[PDB]
Design a protein around this ligand. Structure first.
Ligand code: MG
Ligand code: MG
Ligand code: MG
Ligand code: MG
Ligand code: MG
Length: 264
């Protein structure tokens, strides 16, 4: 069931697998390309994570008061574990910090074992946010997709002596509280809808490896953007929410059978 790959007069065999899991609208699809390379002294799998984390944006309020809960940071952790601590994340994308709305890069495998950043390409959008790769070691790759500023240039630190933080304030003078937040069509899709992460990595294993595990951890840190009517105008305040949300998905990396298998 393997396919021959060729490069510079050398050949190897590749195998593909994928599995997917979801819970409460949070989704993780982990796809793999396993390489059995006679020209390398280890085994490698390129893994591609695609998923979705709902924004859970919510608005509450009344005539003089409003609260908008919104996602300030999405955190994605991908952890590798195995009983003999032999299997390592060799590299992962995206790297460093990316402020561009469209994130796109590739991780490639060369026959002989070289990994460069057979290929896996990632792509996602992050309007008004940035991606910070916060961890990149042998057993953890982690990324924060963190809010930067609205198109109007308001951020979580913005402060006006009268209006406070105007972050998602629709009008200084008008509207009831629950009707005074930025419309969905004027918000980043990461706030109105959610985030669609796409990250990738390369795992390296000893030749005799039969199984390991990948754990995908999703965390969404919410903030509360609050409006209070102050006699003649609205005043906004942004703070950390007292709640955040978390979901994780574990996948067996079945090196022996070249399969990715979600653990129920
Ligand atoms: Mg399945
Ligand atoms: Mg470690
Ligand atoms: Mg500015
Ligand atoms: Mg909504
Ligand atoms: Mg844990």
């Amino acid at each position: 069931s393997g396919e021959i790959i060729k490069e510079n007069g050398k050949e190897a065999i590749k195998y593909t697998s994928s599995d997917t899991a979801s819970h409460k609208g949070w989704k993780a699809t982990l796809s793999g390309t396993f390489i059995e390379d006679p020209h390398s002294d280890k085994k490698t799998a390129l893994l591609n994570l695609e998923g979705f984390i709902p924004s859970d944006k919510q608005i509450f309020g009344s005539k003089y008061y409003g609260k908008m809960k919104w996602p300030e940071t999405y955190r994605i952790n991908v952890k590798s574990a195995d009983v003999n601590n032999n299997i390592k994340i060799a590299n992962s994308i995206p790297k460093n910090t990316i402020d561009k709305k469209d994130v796109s890069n590739s991780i490639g495998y060369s026959i002989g074992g070289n990994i460069s950043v057979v290929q896996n390409t990632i792509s996602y959008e992050q309007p008004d946010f940035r991606t910070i790769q916060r961890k990149d070691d042998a057993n953890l790759a982690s990324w924060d997709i963190k809010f930067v500023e609205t198109k109007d240039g308001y951020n979580i630190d913005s402060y006006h002596a009268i209006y406070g933080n105007q972050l998602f304030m629709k009008s200084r003078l008008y509207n009831n509280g629950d009707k005074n937040f930025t419309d969905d069509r004027d918000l980043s899709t990461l706030i109105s809808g959610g985030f669609s992460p796409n990250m990738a990595l390369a795992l390296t294993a000893p030749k005799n490896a039969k199984e390991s595990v990948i754990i995908v951890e999703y965390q969404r840190f919410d903030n509360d953007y609050i409006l209070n009517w102050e006699t003649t105008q609205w005043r906004g305040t942004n703070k950390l929410s007292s709640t955040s949300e978390y979901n994780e998905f574990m996948f067996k990396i079945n090196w022996q059978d070249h399969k990715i298998e979600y653990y129920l």
